[PDB]
Amino acid sequence: VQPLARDAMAYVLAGGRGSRLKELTDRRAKPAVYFGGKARIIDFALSNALNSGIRRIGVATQYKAHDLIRHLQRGWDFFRPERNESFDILPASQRVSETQWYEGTADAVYQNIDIIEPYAPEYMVILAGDHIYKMDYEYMLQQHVDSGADVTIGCLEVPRMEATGFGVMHVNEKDEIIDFIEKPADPPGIPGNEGFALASMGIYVFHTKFLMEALRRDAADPTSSRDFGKDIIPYIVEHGKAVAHRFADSCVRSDFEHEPYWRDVGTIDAYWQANIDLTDVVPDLDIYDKSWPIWTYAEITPPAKFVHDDEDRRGSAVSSVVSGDCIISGAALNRSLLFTGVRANSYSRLENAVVLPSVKIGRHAQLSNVVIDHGVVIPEGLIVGEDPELDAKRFRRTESGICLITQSMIDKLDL
Amino acid sequence: VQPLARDAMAYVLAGGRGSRLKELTDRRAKPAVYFGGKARIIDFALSNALNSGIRRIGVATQYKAHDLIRHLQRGWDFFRPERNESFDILPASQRVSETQWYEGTADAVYQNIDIIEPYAPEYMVILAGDHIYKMDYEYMLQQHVDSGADVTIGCLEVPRMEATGFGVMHVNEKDEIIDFIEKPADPPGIPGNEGFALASMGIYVFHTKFLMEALRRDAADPTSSRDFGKDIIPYIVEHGKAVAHRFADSCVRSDFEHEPYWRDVGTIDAYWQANIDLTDVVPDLDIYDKSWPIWTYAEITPPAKFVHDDEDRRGSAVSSVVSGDCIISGAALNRSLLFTGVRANSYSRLENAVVLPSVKIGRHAQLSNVVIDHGVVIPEGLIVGEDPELDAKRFRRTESGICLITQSMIDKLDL
Amino acid sequence: VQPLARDAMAYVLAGGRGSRLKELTDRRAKPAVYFGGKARIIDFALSNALNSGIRRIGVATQYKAHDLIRHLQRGWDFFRPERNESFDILPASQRVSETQWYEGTADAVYQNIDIIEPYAPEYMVILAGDHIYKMDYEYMLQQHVDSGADVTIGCLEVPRMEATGFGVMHVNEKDEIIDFIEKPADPPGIPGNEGFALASMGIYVFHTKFLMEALRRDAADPTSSRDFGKDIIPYIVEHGKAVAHRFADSCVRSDFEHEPYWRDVGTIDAYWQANIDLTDVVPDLDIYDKSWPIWTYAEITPPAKFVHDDEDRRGSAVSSVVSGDCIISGAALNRSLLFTGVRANSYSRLENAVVLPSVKIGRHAQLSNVVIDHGVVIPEGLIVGEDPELDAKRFRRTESGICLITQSMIDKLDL
Amino acid sequence: VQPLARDAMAYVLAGGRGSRLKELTDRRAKPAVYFGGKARIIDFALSNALNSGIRRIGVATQYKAHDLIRHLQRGWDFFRPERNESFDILPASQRVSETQWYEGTADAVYQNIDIIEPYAPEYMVILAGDHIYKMDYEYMLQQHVDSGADVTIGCLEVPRMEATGFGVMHVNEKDEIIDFIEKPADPPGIPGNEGFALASMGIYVFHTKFLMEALRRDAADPTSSRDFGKDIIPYIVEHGKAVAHRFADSCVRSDFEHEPYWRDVGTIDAYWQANIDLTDVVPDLDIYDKSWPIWTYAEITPPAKFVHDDEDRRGSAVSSVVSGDCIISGAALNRSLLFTGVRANSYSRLENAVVLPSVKIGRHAQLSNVVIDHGVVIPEGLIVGEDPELDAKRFRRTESGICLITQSMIDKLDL
């Protein structure tokens, strides 16, 4: 009768590079990347934990975590230990050991056992902190204890051709995992439905004392690369009992989401498309749902302003999403998503543009098919999206034509 | 050396009904009326207190105050007594007396002397809670002490004909008040510039001790209507020293405000105009200033959205102010201000509209020169502003052509 | 799978005066009464809701509420609606009606249906706010929906001699209530265990829809006294399905509580006894347990201080519980519980004393078997507990010999 | 007219290792050392900033900051940027440079120019975070600008032989600094009272623009050890204007403090001394002052409890300071100070003990002249303070008899 999230501690791994996001993560880790005009990427796993009733959260950080920690400090600050809530920000530092470096995602939880065990949670929900998805974790916990499993793994059931980019769980008729392959060219199919492969989300449920034992065992193994997926996961499927849990059984979908929503926005094209899709009439992710809300760090911000309307000038937004503190001054917006603080100035135009917080758009500047990094000041009259060769030289251009624009690229500019 | 705001308590009087706002205050006191897509009216005086360094605030409520109290409870919740901060919400109820209703602005402070005295503030800053203005109260505090006055009164410098609607202080050359007149037919001019009169803002500065005795003297006097402006200040300008502080000395102007800003929006016209004026290219009030910020109760809200762009319908806003969680779906907005939560649907038109939170605009409606009440659902196909006689029979239509539209009115409608 | 508390709203009735507590509730309703150097009495039901996972709480107020409301405002302030948390403080006032008074416990929920229904919780948990107990309401919820009952009523399993003063539920072998008796002289027996009676705690679980219906029907019935225990529930035990829930099945006990703990401290002696019992070596209530914590309003307070140790005076405490901000200066404490802020000065003696916050004990004062009200200043040399006739004339003395001491009594004393 | 603290940013340096505190700072930096059952050492400079009206605070950490940062995260979490308040926690990390270790106190400001400049504070208040004192920084702010100084330096007025351990400022008749000596064997006396010397508090006030220049010149200089007291100030006294501000001009003393209070608790003896002095009848520091309060991280804690009172044992405290969540069970306390969470058990005796949080005192243990580290479990029957050579072998024993006791030493124990 007691919900099991009472006794659970969610541990978010937020050291992920997002190196495939190129300059988008040169000054911040992928979990700190803004998304959706809504939150940072990490806020989803944290919000999933919170709405699932997990009141103990630890966050392991590493790669350039100042922005990330600064965000966690100010957004996730409403846990009080007298209420058996806790939010531990757990960077790598010269604390319990010199290093200043986690040996791997397993070592991120190893070095901080002395923070976990004073809480003594019954279960530990290990989460990747770099995906955008909503999911009730109480379903995984119940399946975990009922099945007697040694580890329950969150899995996407996706068509097999797309599963070639994932780590894939080979599974029997009982959804017990019997093998794990990293990025198979021909992924094993689900028995009885071979067109789909089970695709690891990086979400692992254990019994805490079990994980602590398996985790110290890995800390002493020199064969181990100190990775959950590559070391902890294979040992248990081989010697213990690992059961896959399918994302669709615990996904939390609003009435306006036609299918379970999951995005890893690993590439520039993936990130741009996941954001620009929200300007659809019927987007795949409902950012206006209040049933499974996404908590984030937010400030009181003035509303958005649209100014000028004559023969030469008009500030307006069509097929677009516009956050607060955005002054659209004589600028024409179309199929674009703007975070807070954007200043778009007269005669400028934005199209297919994902504009991160506090960007300025100078007069006459015209930008199409772009991701504009936080705080970029676009010079007056700059054209992006007309000349592919000149665009590829000046900025990071994907093969599909999306230009990522950072301030370091703008500083380097002439003709 | 020390700033005097350290030892000041701001006491906001927020019981005023605001009856000239008609049905706009039928469910809420005027200090709780939304304004500017920015805050409630009360928040300005409260934020002037905050920004002036006054960390002890009391608010007297009375007239329909649940909405008011709930906003105060959820927005102004960051004061801790261990830091010598307090925020007291003081409604008339069954506490120190039966009654359950203050008999005036002076009674509103007098009944709560047992709340003030334990704080023992050196100074009292009595504030009208129903006006929109920015002011650094520390200037008034310096002049009150340096002047040795018994009461210091904040006054607007106004052309005399406009002063006909105010309480007016007659002063000598040294800005010492010699007389007070309520709505003088011919207002006494300022010496040396007889083109202007001193119009009282409802802001008084006392020594707390001098104040306490004056209230006690007021509560024993049966000639007194228990009113600060009618009974407390007249007595002092007669038998003691009452000096006038000019708004322009203390007003906080951002670099984008061409003159000191003060509105009382006491009429549906004045309210609509002040809101609509924020849609100007260069507005008189700069709601994007951060140097003198307006705190209010804000929640995390999704951004604004504009959808549809075909030959027949296009969602967009021009010369407009739009708040978060507004979905503008195939609807046209022009010179309109929208608060949070508005749903405007296909082929509807807004012009010169002030739209309060959570209003739904049905398909094909066309509204012009309107103030729409909070949460109002506008039926599909409604027309306002085309037929003055039709509009006046259905809604509170002003002589100037503004229609105040409540859900009470909508519910009564056929043709 | 999902815990039912997610879909519940706890509604706490905190209007009861507690008139048998006499002067102790002359200025504050019983739920606001301090208890245990721990919290106020209402802080047990609210924490049960919190710890049980109920995130929406309403508090119905009425009798002398200013202290209670100020406490809820400042202590219970960590709920944000974006997380679908809410804490509504709902006093009787000119809101949806003139009244300024609820007509009964049922009416207190009736007049606030417009607060409940926007939340649309699936279940209402109606709670008395004047008892000291720990309880996990998730148990009653799942019992409620699996039994199909129209009401699930929390009941104490007590010796029928003790149920003399309780509203008693008459049940069968299925724990379904046949009849309700208000204070039976000889109360009915549990079938199969007639020596124990089912005593109503005043804790009701409904389906929200059904409760709304019962309450509109009760609101239109003129036979009804608009009370839960006498109108809403007796109707259902007759026409619907009413099943009793027993305290021991859902009581939250720490490993240091030998029996399920519940106290209503309805009398001076009951209140003194429950407080003074926490000075025991093995107390009934474990106020040091952290597993089902009691949240309250608490301020950073300095530690307790004990000074003086010579032949004539020694500040010390024995068999006593001493809060922070207490300075025991040359004063002797024994078997006493002191709330925060007490100053006991030289040569004074406390024995068998419950001392509420901020009391001052003057020099040479000797007090035995006392309840000292909040803020009381005990004059130098006062002797209480030596002469019963003198004590009964000066203060409120129980037949068992406890004197409750208020400041209005002290102010009236010569010899 | 406006207070200068509105335009100032406090920058606390809390990287100090406190090496002379020996094992007491093995696991924590000195600013995180508990003190006085009141707060951590860092909490005094932070509170002086807060109470002085400085709403922007930066804290530089370095040596083992995990406890420190976590304390700042959970304690100093009530600043909001939209109210022009900020609290930046700034450890040396991979952020703007590899390093992972500041080169000194000046470099700890220099490396975070990019944090301060967006705030554009007019003034910088550089504070040492490892001293216990109370001080109204607004006085320094006025002197600095009224003086036209390039840096104002807080100085203690100390008899000359005690200035032997300080950086000492040689001053002229109008308190302008003409020279600075690091630990002068014979400190330069103040002109006119040659019995006293101005000892540096490590408190500096600059104009922000001049400081950031001085930091950048310092960063380009290889002769500079990148430290404020050794490099920044010595440059200024030579080539610019440097003025002294005396601690007694601006120190905030409560009515019960006979002298300006400043302590550096730099040794085990000094640390034990300052804590144990708080058990005095009239202490030098009044921790019960509410006029200049010390904010800290505080949890809701149960009160203190004393139990047993027989022929053989009695739980009591004499001449002692006892925090909440302390259960004194059959233990005798004299002239001791206990932080929260102490558990002292039957037949144990403590005298002149400073007992840090969560310490367990086993039965029959007897300890005198003692500092017990956080969470230490003292084994039953341990005897300390009786045999110096034994104590000094098992423990870190001062020349004056104080033993600092860590769990690492208990773990190694036999006879």
Curated annotation (Swiss-Prot), chains A, B, C, D:
Binding site for alpha-D-glucose 1-phosphate: 102, 167, 182-183, 200
Catalytic activity: alpha-D-glucose 1-phosphate + ATP + H(+) = ADP-alpha-D-glucose + diphosphate
E.C. number(s) listed in UniProt: 2.7.7.27
Highest taxon, organism lineage: Bacteria
Keyword Magnesium: no
Key words, A-Z: ATP-binding, Carbohydrate metabolism, Glycogen biosynthesis, Glycogen metabolism, Nucleotide-binding, Nucleotidyltransferase, Transferase
Statement: the UniProt record of this protein carries the keyword Lyase: no
InterPro entries: ADP-Glc_PPase, ADP_Glu_pyroP_CS, GlgC_bac, GlmU/GlgC-like_hexapep, NTP_transferase_dom, Nucleotide-diphossugar_trans, Trimer_LpxA-like_sf
Pathway: Glycan biosynthesis; glycogen biosynthesis
Subunit and partners: Homotetramer.
Its biological purpose: Involved in the biosynthesis of ADP-glucose, a building block required for the elongation reactions to produce glycogen. Catalyzes the reaction between ATP and alpha-D-glucose 1-phosphate (G1P) to produce pyrophosphate and ADP-Glc.
Name this polypeptide is given: Glucose-1-phosphate adenylyltransferase
Species this protein is from: Agrobacterium fabrum (strain C58 / ATCC 33970)
